[PDB]
Enzyme design. Structure first.
Site, PDB file in Angstrom:
ATOM      1  N   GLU A  14      -2.222  52.980  24.288  1.00 16.35           N
ATOM      2  CA  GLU A  14      -2.928  53.432  22.907  1.00 16.35           C
ATOM      3  C   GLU A  14      -4.122  54.217  23.706  1.00 16.35           C
ATOM      4  OE1 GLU A  14      -3.765  50.348  20.104  1.00 16.35           O
ATOM      5  OE2 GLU A  14      -2.857  49.054  21.361  1.00 16.35           O
ATOM      6  N   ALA A  45     -13.053  56.005  49.678  1.00 23.04           N
ATOM      7  CA  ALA A  45     -13.461  55.383  48.470  1.00 23.04           C
ATOM      8  C   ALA A  45     -12.655  54.565  47.697  1.00 23.04           C
ATOM      9  CB  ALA A  45     -13.725  57.006  47.368  1.00 23.04           C
TER      10      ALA A  45
HETATM   11  N1  LIG Z   1     -18.807  55.162  44.506  1.00 18.15           N
HETATM   12  C1  LIG Z   1     -18.421  55.196  45.618  1.00 18.15           C
HETATM   13  N2  LIG Z   1     -18.154  56.507  46.294  1.00 18.15           N
HETATM   14  C2  LIG Z   1     -17.823  56.615  47.504  1.00 18.15           C
HETATM   15  C3  LIG Z   1     -17.876  55.350  48.303  1.00 18.15           C
HETATM   16  N3  LIG Z   1     -17.435  55.727  49.638  1.00 18.15           N
HETATM   17  C4  LIG Z   1     -17.123  57.301  49.565  1.00 18.15           C
HETATM   18  N4  LIG Z   1     -17.375  57.888  48.377  1.00 18.15           N
HETATM   19  C5  LIG Z   1     -17.615  59.165  47.921  1.00 18.15           C
HETATM   20  O1  LIG Z   1     -16.223  59.782  48.589  1.00 18.15           O
HETATM   21  C6  LIG Z   1     -16.619  61.175  49.053  1.00 18.15           C
HETATM   22  C7  LIG Z   1     -16.020  61.573  50.341  1.00 18.15           C
HETATM   23  O2  LIG Z   1     -14.685  61.368  50.268  1.00 18.15           O
HETATM   24  P1  LIG Z   1     -13.961  59.885  50.961  1.00 18.15           P
HETATM   25  O3  LIG Z   1     -14.547  58.750  50.269  1.00 18.15           O
HETATM   26  O4  LIG Z   1     -14.273  60.026  52.451  1.00 18.15           O
HETATM   27  O5  LIG Z   1     -12.434  60.044  50.755  1.00 18.15           O
HETATM   28  P2  LIG Z   1     -11.232  60.318  51.881  1.00 18.15           P
HETATM   29  O6  LIG Z   1      -9.997  60.799  51.130  1.00 18.15           O
HETATM   30  O7  LIG Z   1     -11.013  59.133  52.745  1.00 18.15           O
HETATM   31  O8  LIG Z   1     -11.651  61.626  52.693  1.00 18.15           O
HETATM   32  P3  LIG Z   1     -11.143  61.691  54.252  1.00 18.15           P
HETATM   33  O9  LIG Z   1     -12.222  60.906  55.046  1.00 18.15           O
HETATM   34  O10 LIG Z   1     -11.054  63.258  54.617  1.00 18.15           O
HETATM   35  O11 LIG Z   1     -10.057  61.093  54.381  1.00 18.15           O
HETATM   36  C8  LIG Z   1     -18.047  61.253  48.809  1.00 18.15           C
HETATM   37  O12 LIG Z   1     -18.484  62.101  47.959  1.00 18.15           O
HETATM   38  C9  LIG Z   1     -18.863  59.773  48.617  1.00 18.15           C
HETATM   39  O13 LIG Z   1     -19.658  59.826  47.650  1.00 18.15           O
HETATM   40  C10 LIG Z   1     -17.906  54.274  47.808  1.00 18.15           C
HETATM   41  O14 LIG Z   1     -17.836  53.201  48.297  1.00 18.15           O
HETATM   42  N5  LIG Z   1     -18.265  54.304  46.437  1.00 18.15           N
END
Ligand SMILES: Nc1nc2c(ncn2[C@@H]2O[C@H](COP(=O)(O)OP(=O)(O)OP(=O)(O)O)[C@@H](O)[C@H]2O)c(=O)[nH]1
Ligand SMILES: Nc1nc2c(ncn2[C@@H]2O[C@H](COP(=O)(O)OP(=O)(O)OP(=O)(O)O)[C@@H](O)[C@H]2O)c(=O)[nH]1
Ligand SMILES: Nc1nc2c(ncn2[C@@H]2O[C@H](COP(=O)(O)OP(=O)(O)O)[C@@H](O)[C@H]2O)c(=O)[nH]1
Ligand SMILES: Nc1nc2c(ncn2[C@@H]2O[C@H](COP(=O)(O)OP(=O)(O)O)[C@@H](O)[C@H]2O)c(=O)[nH]1
Ligand SMILES: [Mg+2]
Ligand SMILES: [Mg+2]
Lengths: 427, 55, 430, 427, 430
Positions: free
Chosen positions: C245, C12
């Site tokens: 702030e 993410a």
């Molecule tokens: N807004 C947004 N949310 C995302 C995106 N990609 C993944 N998510 C959110 O991320 C969550 C899952 O966790 P990850 O994004 O895979 O984070 P991570 O730390 O890489 O997890 P691991 O694969 O275990 O390492 C889900 O709830 C998704 O909704 C994105 O491109 N945009």
């Protein structure tokens, strides 16, 4: 760099595995001589997951083939892609299989066991990292059922951390190819429950049913049946090999779907399977795949989910598609069929999206689910085993190998307890 | 920048001479003298079969 | 000058980040290679020759997401040290990313963030991105914050996280990771902003006109909020607001810091052709429940201090009339001990549109940051989901085997339980 | 300038050496007529180690040939490289071998020894420097087992400082070609322990097993076995003949490998070996050589290292390669397999690198190890000697040559003491 | 004028010397044959006409390594009397290189070095290269220093030795050889610098991007240190540091003299394109554990005085700010009875490159020599390796057979224990 070592055992494993490499080689674009003649740069990104490279641009799979008789081996090399494999990974005996679990486990297994492990050691310790192994075998026979379980203990002893993913074919209810299957299946289950991390169960009858109901094949052969199984094996590891919007490899799947160490037996299904006449009527949308996956007829195991309740469910999607549309369908199917899910686990559906689809198909999906319906399949073999064991039977063939009669009682006791365990968690 | 692009040119040259090793598999197989070819030495013609003992 | 450091964790954080830097590079006028065809110092440094480099670090435990940047068009922009990739991901397991795998890479990362801070002459804060459900987002994010707290101390560490949705869920173990991470975040973070995918889906379909979005469109929406958030530090404005702030103005107590986000106008280019979109219009659109980036209705709760950020053609006279009107609206509540209740800022530079962009070219836009007790609704749903699974202990064995002691599970539940009743006391009045 | 004197005694030694000169002459580029026609100036740098030059550009080896009957001398004379040797160096008797240790050591050895020692003397005194001697012989025969020990004692008397490295072949465990070997080997062991600095043991059976398993040779003649053994002699002394990044001569090896005066028997090996046609499947790199070298199947002696533990080990590498790669591999194999190495000696693996690999290979390696597994082999010969000696049996043929029965008891006593000394240091 | 004598002993010394004299000849502008297509005289003698000859003595007990130079390109540069070769090497045996073989060639060696110093009007020190594990580097090196102490007396004798690595090992009898040579080094040497292959390998892989280095790449790294070490006597600058200044400034006592070395920046072409590499950054790179050329963590012990040398367009104001910044690091521990703590050096001649090189073309660089108690960790390692072997008398028969007495084995162990006592007693509280 999450290498996986592939092991094939018995007649069932070698023919399924051989068809499996035809699928992957065309996906990555490898000519049957072993050279890359592909069409995209993304293919060579992560081919290291399954292949080693011989100096010269020639790629060799991480495959180990095991059998007790060399008859099936020469049928594999006669195949188109048989030249690909490394000649020294061919490990075989010079005795009949016997269709006997005890004979494979005690007499011929020990002689071949030491040679096989070193062949495993070469491929396991030749790579930068190792995530897990991949075993393909059937449970009704004597070679894959018997020797497969012995190798499963040795792999667990040496390499505890790694994922021991196995794919199994379960003896059929109605028509089956072996008399002594209840003995072979009951004894093998004890080793699967305690040693392997993930088990996927395939029934041959459901594979026939899908072919005649959906694909409308007038004359299905074992090639078409084995083609369906290879798709699921291809789908699960696709997250390792290609980029995606939401990644999910093997270790994610085990954590989410498995709530307790012993409940890890799974059913699978593949969508879209399109009839050759219905293609002109079916508009490919994301909800259309969702209908096929959760449909009971599409399940590759002849256990009806409606008779049980789901614990966890997982769906994999391949291709460029909307993230909102995928997530909305999981909510839709969960909320519209609430009677088939357990209350004390919210959000029972796991989802994933991978960017690159199989050739020819612009979108496809894979399903892996865990349910209490497995109590059906084990009750079936338990009933046949009891009647075959209440009076003695072919058993003298197993006693003359070294197996003690107490092992059958232990085999049933552990198998019976797993049935009761799924009974309890339904409440 | 130039030295970096120069550096990659050297690596590609090095890999070419690495991939030459296909040449010395030829010697390894074509080695008939060393009997990876299994020569059947010493003029077997049934008048005799032998010229050098071990042959 | 004045600098801010951006840190990105997990899937993410990373793919949000390349969306944000696509926006910033286009906004400032720099090619993807770092050359030119000002406020550069706030986000960039000048390398050898006229080449620039971001003040950013990309961290993940698996290489797929990072390697997309390495082969992408932006590959020449980043210094290869900034892109940090692990070997095997956390498998959505908090213990795996906190104890076992997280400690394999923690010390390598801390050198790179500290080394980048040496080039930071006037450093004033950090920006950190998470996804709560992920193992690396939660597990390694908590360890990163815990170490960073003692390293720097009196520096404003701001976070921008994605709160798990009320019903849309992609991980079954999602409640476990969020609560365990919550205990670590609450003590160390200065302030962390909540958003959720479910509301961003609804807004990007209803107001912005798309039938079927992807994560790509949502990441561009997030970039606008951060762009307006930092616009006070970069370009001129009639009312400037620094990072420090926001820390003081929004949060009444230590533990109640979590604000929510909103933005207006979000309007497609056909719909933007219809209306003039004055200052009063955009201020009224901010406060409707439809525009909230977190799917919790503020009418269930009450408002404490809110911060408003205007960009473009807005004039200070029109701002005062608009906020005065909003106080007259009786569908909006404020706690009695916040009679002032507002912090406002005005900046002159309008937002920047993107090739392949979705939004319109509006020349006056407003962003809102508000702290509300309606967030307490979200905690109860998350807390409820945790208790159902924990009563039968559906997934404890995975976490314990990866280095966690079980005693941490009830502790994080207790610390959340206090926060739940913390919100009710603040919700009361005298 | 570290010249070495080579002596060939008996049938087994003579034929191995005959193949051994073909290996060197090709590696240096000397025409079979003794003339230089090579391709590189580096070949003429240090040819003085093994060869003498006759005026006219004709190069003559430092070789001395010994036998009790003229049969093998005529066989070498008709060989391809027979004209190479110096005709005055051919020394032989006119009596049957007898396959008798006592007859060779006492009856015929004494008359031949005084002439043989003077034949050694012309070559040993003719050169600028002399580091050590090189002997090839068996330990189951009558000429090599007996006369080789006699010359070894005399050479120690005259040249105490020099390294008396010998190359020996041990009687096989399963099938062997002589009834009375246990008498012969036991009597010879007493001499070799006290007089020779370096002894390398090689088994014919392991040579056959290497031939089928790796080389696939369906009918391995004695040419292949001798060529494989000839590789090891060529590898060990290569550090003297060609430059390299880290030089390691014979005396460097003795001080490193040998911890105590009597534990100096060694097992040897070589890598890489070519599987016919399967070399196209293999990507040869430095890690791949490491895999073969420490693979137990490539050992040339039929004593399993895994049943014992290691004390010291040494590996040579030939070719242009990375020094970090070599040093990391030695550490890797020592850390991953701690069970087989001794605690009270850290860094059990020595390493070395040479610049110029042999013709036909862009890189090659040599492995020399010293382990407690030699106790398996010496138990074998002691057991056969014991049950033969109790019955007396064939002693009738040794007594009538002048050997007292007291010598059999002494020979066993020293042999058994050697076994115990390996037992004790395992703690 | 001012001048230094270089002696190379064993393979590990002469192979480094090959790289040093390549760098030295190309830096001044002398062809490998000794002609021209200044500071020449500190390292070379001008025989006349247009030819130059180095001040070097190459010695090893076996002719293979030396004959490479006699047949190589540089054969025209050296004077054949300087190239000395024995007959048969020391077989990694101290007794063989000190007692039996060593004394056969020592007096021939001493005549040449003394003869070379007669042409040397202003000698101020010696540079000698060793490998501790080798028989000739330790056995013959000890015999060399014992004689040069009486031959020349109060002239600084500096050494550059490769200390045995913690885990990487190429000689089984290596731990025996180091302790025997330690006794002879400790009394006669003025100061001996420490390097090891294991840290150079990791440094040559991480900073310099080389997949698979050889001994060649490591040798160019060491040549740069000595070139920076001696540059104060050759080129102009702002703060000159003579050889004698190292002797007093670095070592507080008689027996604590062993320093460790560091260099910065060591960077590839692609990374140096991104990094600015000003004075503040290069000073921070020195103190990281990764850049140390000895694989020992400085954080285990504390620092005594360090010496810093700068080569380039470096301004004194920036130097003072950098070290003052270093003193603000609480992870860096200094001993209280050394509150001064530092000596500085600045020179104008930038670092020099080599065709087919591995390094980047930087405008400035800094070289560090540090004295620390952390290397007491290294000695306790080597002492333990010795104990296991000698407890069972593991290799005594080889050494005793070549003239060595057994009585030296406990005595050499005793002197090392005194050195181990001396270090932590030094590091003890004020
Ligand atoms: N807004 C947004 N949310 C995302 C995106 N990609 C993944 N998510 C959110 O991320 C969550 C899952 O966790 P990850 O994004 O895979 O984070 P991570 O730390 O890489 O997890 P691991 O694969 O275990 O390492 C889900 O709830 C998704 O909704 C994105 O491109 N945009
Ligand atoms: N940096 C560097 N180190 C080397 C080189 N060659 C050898 N060494 C090191 O030298 C150490 C062993 O010392 P020796 O190679 O035996 O040197 P020596 O003093 O001549 O010893 P002898 O050969 O027995 O006379 C090893 O640990 C190597 O790491 C080299 O070319 N460069
Ligand atoms: N699905 C599938 N089943 C097969 C195939 N080949 C054989 N089988 C079935 O697998 C079952 C067990 O096979 P068996 O020969 O006993 O395997 P083995 O004993 O492990 O070597 C038999 O009932 C076969 O009918 C195949 O290609 N695909
Ligand atoms: N490797 C190898 N072994 C041989 C050869 N010829 C004979 N042998 C073996 O050497 C052993 C004893 O040889 P022998 O004839 O007694 O040698 P002798 O002492 O000179 O009489 C026999 O068991 C043979 O198997 C050969 O050409 N090569
Ligand atoms: Mg991640
Ligand atoms: Mg030497």
């Amino acid at each position: 760099v999450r290498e996986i070592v592939h092991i094939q055992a018995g007649q069932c494993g070698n023919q399924i595995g051989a068809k499996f490499w035809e699928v992957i080689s065309d996906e990555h674009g490898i000519d049957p001589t072993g050279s890359y003649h592909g069409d995209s740069d993304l293919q060579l990104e992560r081919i290291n997951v399954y292949y080693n490279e011989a100096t010269g641009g020639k790629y060799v799979p991480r495959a180990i083939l095991v059998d007790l008789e060399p008859g099936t081996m020469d049928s594999v090399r006669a195949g188109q892609f048989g030249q690909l494999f490394r000649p020294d990974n061919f490990v075989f005996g010079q005795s009949g299989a016997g269709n006997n679990w005890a004979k494979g486990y005690y007499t011929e297994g020990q002689e071949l066991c030491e040679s096989i492990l070193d062949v495993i050691r070469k491929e396991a310790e030749s790579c930068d990292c190792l995530q897990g192994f991949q075993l393909v075998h059937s449970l009704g026979g004597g070679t894959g059922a018997g020797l497969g379980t012995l190798l499963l203990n040795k792999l667990r002893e040496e390499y505890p951390d790694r994922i021991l993913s196995t794919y199994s074919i379960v003896p059929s209810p109605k028509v089956s190819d072996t008399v002594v299957e209840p003995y072979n299946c009951t004894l093998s289950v004890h080793q699967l429950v305690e040693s392997a991390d993930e088990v996927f169960c395939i029934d041959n009858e459901a594979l026939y049913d899908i072919c005649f109901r959906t694909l409308k094949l007038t004359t299905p052969t074992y090639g078409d049946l084995n083609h369906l199984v290879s798709m699921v094996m291809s789908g699960t590891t696709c997250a390792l090999r290609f980029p995606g919007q939401l990644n999910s490899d093997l270790r994610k799947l085990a954590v989410n779907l498995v709530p307790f160490p012993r409940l890890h037996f799974f059913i699978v299904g593949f969508a879209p399977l399109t009839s050759r006449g219905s293609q002109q009527y079916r508009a490919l949308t994301v909800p259309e795949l969702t209908s096929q996956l959760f449909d009971n007829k599409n399940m590759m195991a002849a256990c009806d989910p409606r008779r049980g309740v789901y614990l966890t469910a997982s769906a994999h999607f391949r291709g460029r598609m909307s993230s909102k549309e995928v997530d909305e369908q999981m909510l839709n199917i969960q909320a519209r069929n609430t009677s088939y899910f357990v209350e004390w686990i919210p959000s029972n559906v796991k989802s994933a999206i991978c960017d690159i689809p199989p050739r020819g198909l612009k979108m496809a999906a894979t399903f892996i689910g865990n349910t209490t319906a497995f109590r059906e399949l084990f009750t079936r073999v338990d009933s046949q085993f009891q009647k075959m064991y209440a009076r003695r039977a072919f058993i003298h063939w197993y006693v003359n190998e070294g197996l003690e009669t107490v092992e059958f009682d232990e085999a049933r006791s552990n198998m019976t307890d797993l049935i009761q365990e799924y009974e309890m968690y339904e409440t | 920048l130039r030295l970096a692009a120069e550096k990659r040119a050297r690596e590609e040259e090095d890999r070419r001479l690495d991939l030459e090793l296909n040449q010395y598999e030829i010697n390894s197989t074509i080695d008939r003298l060393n009997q990876s070819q299994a020569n059947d030495e010493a003029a077997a013609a049934n008048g005799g079969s032998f010229v050098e003992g071990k042959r | 000058m004045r600098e801010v450091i951006s840190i990105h964790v997990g899937q993410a954080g990373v793919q949000i980040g390349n969306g944000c830097w696509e926006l910033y590079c286009l906004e400032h006028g720099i090619q993807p290679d770092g050359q030119l065809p000002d406020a550069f110092n706030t986000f960039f440094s000048e390398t050898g020759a006229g080449k620039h480099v971001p003040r950013a670090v990309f961290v993940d435990l698996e290489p797929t997401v990072v390697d997309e940047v390495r082969t992408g068009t932006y590959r020449q922009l980043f210094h290869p040290e900034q892109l940090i990739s692990g070997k095997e991901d956390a498998a959505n397991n908090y213990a795996r990313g906190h104890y076992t795998v997280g400690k394999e890479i923690i010390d390598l990362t801390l050198d790179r963030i500290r080394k980048l801070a040496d080039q930071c002459t006037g450093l004033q804060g950090f920006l950190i991105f998470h996804s709560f459900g992920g193992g690396t987002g939660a597990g390694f994010g908590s360890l990163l914050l815990e170490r960073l707290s003692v390293d720097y101390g009196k520096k404003s560490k701001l976070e921008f996280t994605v709160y798990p949705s009320p019903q849309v869920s992609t991980a079954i173990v999602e409640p476990y990771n969020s609560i365990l991470a919550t205990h670590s975040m609450i003590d160390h973070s200065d302030c962390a902003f909540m958003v959720d995918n479910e509301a961003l889906y609804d807004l990007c379909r209803r107001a912005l006109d798309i039938e079927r979005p992807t994560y790509t469109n949502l990441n561009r929406l997030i970039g606008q909020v951060v762009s307006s958030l930092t616009a006070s530090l970069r370009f001129d404005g009639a009312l400037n607001v620094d990072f420090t702030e926001f820390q003081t103005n929004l949060v009444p107590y230590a533990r109640i810091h979590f604000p929510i986000c909103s933005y207006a106008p979000v309007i497609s280019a056909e719909k933007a052709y219809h209306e003039q979109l004055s200052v009063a219009e955009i201020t009224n659109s901010l406060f409707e429940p439809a525009n909230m980036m977190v799917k919790c209705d503020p009418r269930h709760g009450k408002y404490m201090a809110c911060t408003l950020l205007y960009r473009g053609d807005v004039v200070p006279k029109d701002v005062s009339a608009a906020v005065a009107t909003i106080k007259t609206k009786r569908t909006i509540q404020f706690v009695d001990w916040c009679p002032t209740g507002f912090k406002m800022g005005i900046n002159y530079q309008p937002p920047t549109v993107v090739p392949g962009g979705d939004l319109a070219k509006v020349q006056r836009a407003v962003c809102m940051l508000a702290n509300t007790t309606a967030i307490a609704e979200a905690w109860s749903r998350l807390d409820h989901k945790f208790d159902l699974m924990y009563a039968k202990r559906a997934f404890v064995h995975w976490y314990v085997g990866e280095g966690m002691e079980e005693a941490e599970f009830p502790e994080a539940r207790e610390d959340l339980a206090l926060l739940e009743k913390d919100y009710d006391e603040v919700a009361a009045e005298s």
